[PDB]
Amino acid sequence: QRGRDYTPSNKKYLQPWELERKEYVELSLAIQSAYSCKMLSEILKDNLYMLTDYQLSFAMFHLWNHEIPIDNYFYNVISPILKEYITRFDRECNKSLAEIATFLGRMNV
Amino acid sequence: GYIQRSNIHEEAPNTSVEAKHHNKTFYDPILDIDEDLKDDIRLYGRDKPDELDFTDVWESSYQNIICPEYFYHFWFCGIVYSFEPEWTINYPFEKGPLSPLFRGEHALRRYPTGEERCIACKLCQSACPARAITIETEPRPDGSRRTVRYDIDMTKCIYCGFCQEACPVDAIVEGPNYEQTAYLHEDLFYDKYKLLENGDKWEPQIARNIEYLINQPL
Amino acid sequence: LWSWTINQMLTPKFWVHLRREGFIKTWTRGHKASRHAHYVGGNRTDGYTKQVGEDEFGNRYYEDFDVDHKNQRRWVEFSDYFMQMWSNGDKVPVGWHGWLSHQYDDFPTRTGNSAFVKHHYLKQHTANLSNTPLNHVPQGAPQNLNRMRFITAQRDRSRAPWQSPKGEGVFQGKKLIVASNSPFIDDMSIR
Amino acid sequence: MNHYWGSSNTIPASSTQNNNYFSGGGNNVTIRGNEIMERLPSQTPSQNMVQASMKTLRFYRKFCRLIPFILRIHNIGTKFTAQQAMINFGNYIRERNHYRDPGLIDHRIQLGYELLYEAEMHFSQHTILMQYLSPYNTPLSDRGYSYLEKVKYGNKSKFLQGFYKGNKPTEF
Amino acid sequence: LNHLLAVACHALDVGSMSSVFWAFEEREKLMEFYERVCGARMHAAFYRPNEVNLNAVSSFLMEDILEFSRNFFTTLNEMHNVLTYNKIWKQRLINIGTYSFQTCLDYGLTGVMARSCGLKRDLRLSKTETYANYYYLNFRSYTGQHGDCYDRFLIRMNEMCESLNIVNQSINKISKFNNIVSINTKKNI
Amino acid sequence: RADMAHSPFHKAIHDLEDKRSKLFPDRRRIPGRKAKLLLAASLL
Amino acid sequence: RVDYIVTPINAVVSWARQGSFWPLTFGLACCAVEMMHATVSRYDFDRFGVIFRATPRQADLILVAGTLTNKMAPGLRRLYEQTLDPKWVLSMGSCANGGGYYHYSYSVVRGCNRIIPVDIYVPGCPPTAEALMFGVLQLQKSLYRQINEGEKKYNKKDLTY
Amino acid sequence: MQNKYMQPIQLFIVFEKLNSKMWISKKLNSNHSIALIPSNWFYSINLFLKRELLFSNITLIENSAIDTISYNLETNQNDLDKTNIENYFFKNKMLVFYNYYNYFLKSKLTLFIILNNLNKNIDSIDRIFANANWLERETSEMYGINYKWKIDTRKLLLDYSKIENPMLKEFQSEGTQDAFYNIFENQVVVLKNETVEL
Amino acid sequence: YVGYRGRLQYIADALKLFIKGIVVPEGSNKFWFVAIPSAAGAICYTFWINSMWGPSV
Amino acid sequence: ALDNSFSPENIAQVQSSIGDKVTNIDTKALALNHQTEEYHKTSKLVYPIRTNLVVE
Numbered sequence A: 001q002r003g004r005d006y007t008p009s010n011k012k013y014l015q016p017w018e019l020e021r022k023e024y025v026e027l028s029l030a031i032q033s034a035y036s037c038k039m040l041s042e043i044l045k046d047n048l049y050m051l052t053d054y055q056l057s058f059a060m061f062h063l064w065n066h067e068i069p070i071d072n073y074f075y076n077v078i079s080p081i082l083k084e085y086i087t088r089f090d091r092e093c094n095k096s097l098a099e100i101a102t103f104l105g106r107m108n109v
Numbered sequence B: 001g002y003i004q005r006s007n008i009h010e011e012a013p014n015t016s017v018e019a020k021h022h023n024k025t026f027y028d029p030i031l032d033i034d035e036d037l038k039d040d041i042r043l044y045g046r047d048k049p050d051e052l053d054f055t056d057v058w059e060s061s062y063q064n065i066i067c068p069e070y071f072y073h074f075w076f077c078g079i080v081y082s083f084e085p086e087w088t089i090n091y092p093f094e095k096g097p098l099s100p101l102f103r104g105e106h107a108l109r110r111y112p113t114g115e116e117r118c119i120a121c122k123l124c125q126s127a128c129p130a131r132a133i134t135i136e137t138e139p140r141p142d143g144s145r146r147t148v149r150y151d152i153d154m155t156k157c158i159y160c161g162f163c164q165e166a167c168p169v170d171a172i173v174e175g176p177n178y179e180q181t182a183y184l185h186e187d188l189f190y191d192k193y194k195l196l197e198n199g200d201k202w203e204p205q206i207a208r209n210i211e212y213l214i215n216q217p218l
Numbered sequence C: 001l002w003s004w005t006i007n008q009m010l011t012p013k014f015w016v017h018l019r020r021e022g023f024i025k026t027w028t029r030g031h032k033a034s035r036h037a038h039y040v041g042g043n044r045t046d047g048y049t050k051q052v053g054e055d056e057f058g059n060r061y062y063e064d065f066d067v068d069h070k071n072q073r074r075w076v077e078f079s080d081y082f083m084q085m086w087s088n089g090d091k092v093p094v095g096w097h098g099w100l101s102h103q104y105d106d107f108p109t110r111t112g113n114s115a116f117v118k119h120h121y122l123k124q125h126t127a128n129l130s131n132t133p134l135n136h137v138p139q140g141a142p143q144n145l146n147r148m149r150f151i152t153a154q155r156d157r158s159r160a161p162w163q164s165p166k167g168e169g170v171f172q173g174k175k176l177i178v179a180s181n182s183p184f185i186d187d188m189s190i191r
Numbered sequence D: 001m002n003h004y005w006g007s008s009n010t011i012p013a014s015s016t017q018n019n020n021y022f023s024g025g026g027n028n029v030t031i032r033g034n035e036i037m038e039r040l041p042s043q044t045p046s047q048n049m050v051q052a053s054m055k056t057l058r059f060y061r062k063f064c065r066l067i068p069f070i071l072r073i074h075n076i077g078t079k080f081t082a083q084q085a086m087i088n089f090g091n092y093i094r095e096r097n098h099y100r101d102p103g104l105i106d107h108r109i110q111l112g113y114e115l116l117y118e119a120e121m122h123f124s125q126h127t128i129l130m131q132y133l134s135p136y137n138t139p140l141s142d143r144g145y146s147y148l149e150k151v152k153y154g155n156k157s158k159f160l161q162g163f164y165k166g167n168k169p170t171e172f
Numbered sequence E: 001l002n003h004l005l006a007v008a009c010h011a012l013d014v015g016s017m018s019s020v021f022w023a024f025e026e027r028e029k030l031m032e033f034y035e036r037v038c039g040a041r042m043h044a045a046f047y048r049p050n051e052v053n054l055n056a057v058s059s060f061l062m063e064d065i066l067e068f069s070r071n072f073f074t075t076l077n078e079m080h081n082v083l084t085y086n087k088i089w090k091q092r093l094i095n096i097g098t099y100s101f102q103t104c105l106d107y108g109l110t111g112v113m114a115r116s117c118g119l120k121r122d123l124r125l126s127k128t129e130t131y132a133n134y135y136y137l138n139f140r141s142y143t144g145q146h147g148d149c150y151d152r153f154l155i156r157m158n159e160m161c162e163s164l165n166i167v168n169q170s171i172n173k174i175s176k177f178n179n180i181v182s183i184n185t186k187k188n189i
Numbered sequence F: 001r002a003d004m005a006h007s008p009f010h011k012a013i014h015d016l017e018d019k020r021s022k023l024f025p026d027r028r029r030i031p032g033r034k035a036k037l038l039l040a041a042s043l044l
Numbered sequence G: 001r002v003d004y005i006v007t008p009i010n011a012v013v014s015w016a017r018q019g020s021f022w023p024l025t026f027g028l029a030c031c032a033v034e035m036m037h038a039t040v041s042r043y044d045f046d047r048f049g050v051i052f053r054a055t056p057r058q059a060d061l062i063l064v065a066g067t068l069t070n071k072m073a074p075g076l077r078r079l080y081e082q083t084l085d086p087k088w089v090l091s092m093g094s095c096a097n098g099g100g101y102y103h104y105s106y107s108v109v110r111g112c113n114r115i116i117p118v119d120i121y122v123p124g125c126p127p128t129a130e131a132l133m134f135g136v137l138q139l140q141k142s143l144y145r146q147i148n149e150g151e152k153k154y155n156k157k158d159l160t161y
Numbered sequence H: 001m002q003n004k005y006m007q008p009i010q011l012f013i014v015f016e017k018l019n020s021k022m023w024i025s026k027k028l029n030s031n032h033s034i035a036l037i038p039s040n041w042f043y044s045i046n047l048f049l050k051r052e053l054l055f056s057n058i059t060l061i062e063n064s065a066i067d068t069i070s071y072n073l074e075t076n077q078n079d080l081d082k083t084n085i086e087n088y089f090f091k092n093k094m095l096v097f098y099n100y101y102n103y104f105l106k107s108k109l110t111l112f113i114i115l116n117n118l119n120k121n122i123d124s125i126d127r128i129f130a131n132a133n134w135l136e137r138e139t140s141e142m143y144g145i146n147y148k149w150k151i152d153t154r155k156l157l158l159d160y161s162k163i164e165n166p167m168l169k170e171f172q173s174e175g176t177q178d179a180f181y182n183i184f185e186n187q188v189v190v191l192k193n194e195t196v197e198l
Numbered sequence I: 001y002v003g004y005r006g007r008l009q010y011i012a013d014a015l016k017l018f019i020k021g022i023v024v025p026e027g028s029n030k031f032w033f034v035a036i037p038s039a040a041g042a043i044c045y046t047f048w049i050n051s052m053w054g055p056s057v
Numbered sequence J: 001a002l003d004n005s006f007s008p009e010n011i012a013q014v015q016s017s018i019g020d021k022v023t024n025i026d027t028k029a030l031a032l033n034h035q036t037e038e039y040h041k042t043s044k045l046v047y048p049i050r051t052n053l054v055v056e
């Protein structure tokens, strides 16, 4: 957006209320529509500056729910993003941590 | 608000047999015969093929000499569709499906003690899109904030439900009654007497529906 | 006539119903609920649908799951069946109205644990009373013989006419002496 | 002329002829034309009150030429004579004669032509359209009038007449 | 709902009778869904700005909608058998009302009337004009190379059929297909 | 993407041969077969 | 006395005119769709012997189903007057009853009863299909009873005079 | 606004004697642009739009008018800025706006024309865009705009034998007359209006 | 419902058609307006003579 | 009429005053439910779904 700085106010991780509702909803819809690791990684990397822990956990849930196979694109693009976000998590990110870990375990990566 | 996209094309799902989510029966050779008919200029426009074939002659002869409409359609509809059970609902002895959200006839409820739930806040009057509710209130001798005149013009009111939605104490409720046919236009000028009588008569079913509606959020 | 057709009387259901309920009841079931000929007493042939319950006006309600269409499971059997086009949908009481409409699967039960509240101020259900002397008459309407009271009250809410003296009255010079009609007490004058 | 008022929009006098074997003619001024009006182009802009006044006079002329046909078809001849209707519409125009805006006058003339066409084609009802033809202060010719008010208030000012008549219901 | 009513009325005007009953049965089912979600079988007044009656939305409603979608193919085929291939229907509609893109453009024709010219104009699948989840659903819009009543009727039938696919995708977007699998038995828990 | 084959969104993909055979036609229409049959039969 | 023959023939006439009750094919607004819904299979009108006729000359009931505009009121009056007697009028919907959602409008008539005599009113906006069915059946019952509502008095011999 | 957008500056490049006043907002679609167009150039501008190469594939989606004379900012009066489009509403008798869609540029273009003359004169474009006929008829009847050189000026959506402009803010929703049935005349008549006040 | 299970619907409609009143338009020709349906009814009720129900029946 | 947060004696007194006889007014039951939050009454629909018949 014009004259917009996406640096988190917490200085740890971005939050949904910082972004415009339209951006959050549209990125969530794109994540839901993604049906392969390649396209999901493309979407996540393109919109990384707007990405949120909630949406990342939701992407993991979508992959698990639709049994999208985990492949080289996942391990090479998505995994670094997951590592960065999980490292930046804190106490208030318990929901995202539990969801991401549970769905990664279920997918059996 | 918007998002940025790098790959406009949504690539087709993997067609490999080994990959998961592979459907071996998605394509049927007998049915998916599109390619044969795809290259036909008649489908794409008003033009005609360079070389007409006797297949068109046979098709035209079948369509014209032996008109297949009066047999094909007659059979398929008259003889076959008549074998399905009738869809009719015997209204006098049976009723169609309704829901607890159904908005029928307006009524005014009371607390279990018998006191009126209506306090003259006029929220329902203001929210009524059709200006069908008229309320005048005066303090009761005991001191309660109760209305002295509460009229709903059933002919002017659109059964939207805004009145019950805006009611903060569930006083005015659009109960399920819908067989409220009136022979005189004056009979549709519902008054406080009529609304309270409707509430007293229909409290059981209205309360039963309100129970489920209140419990849904929980 | 022929409330029960020959093919329906040739079934066990008709004979059991005749044995238990009686000829009059079994024959008038069709008149009470004129529906498809094969639905007289229920769709199944080996027996007749059990009565779900009865309401305060003598109507009998039944539910059969073998009907050929989903929207015919629940049906009524009206006490008053004088002629066709006589009983209407307004005869269903409040408790059974929702059950027929399929709003909920609970039905009124007399003398038992009920799913419907029974308050002290409730009134008995009444059919549509339009076209009857016991119809809704707006206050002040020409039909209402006491329209004068309502009209006078509405007029007085904004402007109450002054009640002028009538008949012979006491005169003090050019003045008519009348006691004040104010209900309020003049406490300062009294004490 | 491809217009509703064109000379070729006349109703033929015969199935195989127009009014004669040696001539072609028809009536389209005092009666409605043969083909319906599909489009009524806006009056060409008038730059002068002279042009505006000419438009008003021509519209009134057309209305006067058409009034007898309108009365006959709508069965309102008894209520007023043709000349009475003409004079009543003249009073209607006189009330508006103070206009001094050519554009407003053109718009008014367009509306008048439209309503005249509606009257010709029975689009309007006689009771709804006779409000323009009705007398301003004279009784309708098909009814018996009441002069009780005039007898009671003979040689009294309009103010006093209105004062006695009242202007509000007295019940409330 | 709208396409059913339009096609039924069109068939009734042309002369076919029973199509109105067949279409109006499905209309009654959809009106039942309306009443179930908002209490009014017509004039729902359901959507409101920045608010939703989440309580009304129920899973069983979605399941009933899925059942309606499955059974709607039967009604579509019943109408299609008596209308689409009928010689009288083809002679009544084909080459009637034919118009070009320029007419479509000059008179501001839009939706089915526009697509029957091949303009390929759909506001749901527009980058800058999409307004709901449509832009992120993989459905198809149909256009005809002949701008006549027959092409418009075919487009309406295909759009009715494709609304089923869109509804199926939308309902799947809110479905939990997978489930916990036991490590020992490799079966759902 | 549901509009293309082998999409992850599809669910009914395993052992659908019998179901598809029951649900959908197993025959193809020859263009002039009905015409020839009916015309020759009518003449004879 | 004629009553001996008139009364049974009155009953037969009322039964026949109740059984055959053909409304007019006339719909103005959304209430039209509800009328069509009653006509179609889910609530078959034909069960009660009501079949719609296009021409007013062949109609017994005038279903005023939809809003009435000032631009249309003369047309409604003409249709009512041209419908062959005997006839009844049924207003359907809030708009037809008392102006409905457009009671405060400059174009809508505040009620079809101002232009026509309305025999029965069916409240709703739109009235449910069952609501319209109930109104029609109530109108049919009232129509059947209208022939003899106990007007004439019985003499000492129980014969009306 | 993450799309490729370009201003419709072709109009003002060609009509070199006009000044440009254009807006885009997130309240509109990403491809929607508003502009101010003078009435005396409106007809020529539409002529250019209807046959220019990239504007050839243009359809007049909508047309209407606003009675700007009675327009007032009811809240946040001080927040108004001189660049806002609302500044042109004040003290102007009428504002007629047209809206077109262009397929080649995948764009929406709205043009606002301010009518300050009391008679509300403006050149019609129904001779250029066919669907503008009924749109302009409705606008003229409901707001009293005197369209000039219009194909058909007859009313559309207004009652017979009546002259009025209901959509003007001066007019009252209840109207000025009601239609009843007169027994003496045995037909529908129209008389003065008495209504109900909530 | 017109007769038990709709057994007398045709009787009811015939009686109702008899009962319904008739008015001839003022502009229409009174004589022909009634003469034409009378001739049509006579012809229609003469139709049945040209019918066979057996070798010479 | 009254919430469970009120005393069981008060609840019983109010119910008796309003003449309620179809509600559980047991003092011990009211005490057990006192200041207790629990979901609404539930029942069970038991498969298979079948029509009740009177075969004899």
Ligand SMILES: CCCCCCCCCCCCCCCCCC(=O)OC[C@H](COP(=O)([O-])OCC(O)COP(=O)([O-])OC[C@@H](COC(=O)CCCCCCCCCCCCCCCCC)OC(=O)CCCCCCCCCCCCCCCCC)OC(=O)CCCCCCCCCCCCCCCCC
Residues within 6 Å of the ligand: C001, C002, C083, C084, I002, I003, I004, I007, I008, I011
């Ligand atoms: C001893 C011999 C006696 C012979 C007597 C003959 C005369 C009387 C026969 C009457 C039979 C029908 C019942 C009529 C009374 C109904 C009363 C009533 O419901 O009141 C409510 C009634 C209105 O309520 P509703 O529910 O609308 O009425 C239902 C209808 O009637 C519609 O329902 P429905 O039930 O009335 O219609 C039934 C009819 C349907 O018919 C039709 O639809 C055809 C209609 C054609 C037009 C006819 C027009 C007639 C106009 C009459 C006008 C009035 C005349 C009055 C004369 C008075 C003279 C004093 O067909 C039948 O079902 C025939 C029944 C008889 C069949 C034979 C029974 C035995 C069979 C099995 C034998 C073997 C058993 C072995 C057992 C072994 C056990 C071990 O109000 C009235 O009082 C009006 C009554 C009108 C009656 C119309 C009858 C029409 C048919 C007449 C001819 C039927 C065939 C007779 C053959 C006789 C051969 C000898």
Ligand SMILES: CCCCCCCCCCCCCCCCCC(=O)OC[C@H](COP(=O)([O-])OCC(O)COP(=O)([O-])OC[C@@H](COC(=O)CCCCCCCCCCCCCCCCC)OC(=O)CCCCCCCCCCCCCCCCC)OC(=O)CCCCCCCCCCCCCCCCC
Residues within 6 Å of the ligand: F027, F028, F029, F030, F031, F033, F034, F036, F037
């Ligand atoms: C007394 C009591 C009476 C009670 C009566 C009760 C009511 C009965 C109603 C009966 C109605 C008729 C049946 C309708 C079935 C509809 C089936 C369906 O949906 O498919 C339609 C089907 C075509 O649609 P489709 O197959 O779905 O098309 C897709 C295909 O993929 C497309 O493939 P394609 O286009 O390539 O070819 C497909 C073609 C197949 O084409 C071929 O395969 C032809 C191949 C040969 C081509 C020509 C080359 C020459 C071949 C001959 C060579 C001979 C010489 C060889 C010399 C060799 C020398 C080395 O299919 C056809 O067969 C179409 C021809 C249509 C024939 C029309 C039949 C009219 C029947 C009228 C019955 C009226 C009954 C009146 C009442 C009773 C009497 C009073 O058409 C039929 O097959 C029609 C039925 C044919 C007759 C089968 C049944 C016969 C028995 C009837 C018994 C009736 C009951 C009472 C009997 C008496 C009891 C005492």
Ligand SMILES: CCCCCCCCCCCCCCCCCC(=O)OC[C@H](COP(=O)([O-])OCC[N+](C)(C)C)OC(=O)CCCCCCCCCCCCCCCCC
Residues within 6 Å of the ligand: C001, C002, C023, C031, C081, C082, C083, C084, I004
């Ligand atoms: C007794 C046990 C065995 C029963 C087997 C079933 C037999 C049913 C036979 C048909 C019904 C007969 C009349 C039932 C009683 C009616 C009493 C009454 O008041 O009638 C008023 C009723 C009034 O009519 P309604 O009650 O039918 O309908 C009017 C009400 N509405 C409008 C709602 C429908 O009169 C009639 O029943 C109609 C006239 C009937 C005329 C024909 C009579 C035939 C009799 C056949 C007897 C066969 C017996 C079986 C053994 C024979 C051996 C040879």
Ligand code: SF4
Residues within 6 Å of the ligand: B106, B127, B128, B129, B130, B131, B132, B133, B152, B156, B157, B158, B159, B160, B161, B162, B163, B164, B174
């Ligand atoms: S249903 Fe709507 S219009 Fe009718 S009284 Fe209630 S709030 Fe007003």
Ligand code: SF4
Residues within 6 Å of the ligand: B117, B118, B119, B120, B121, B122, B123, B124, B125, B135, B166, B167, B168, B169, B170, B171, B172
């Ligand atoms: S019914 Fe409800 S909203 Fe209306 S005045 Fe009474 S308490 Fe207020």
Ligand code: SF4
Residues within 6 Å of the ligand: B158, G029, G030, G031, G065, G066, G067, G092, G093, G094, G095, G096, G100, G101, G124, G125, G126, G127
């Ligand atoms: S009453 Fe309601 S449903 Fe009927 S026409 Fe008026 S607005 Fe439409």
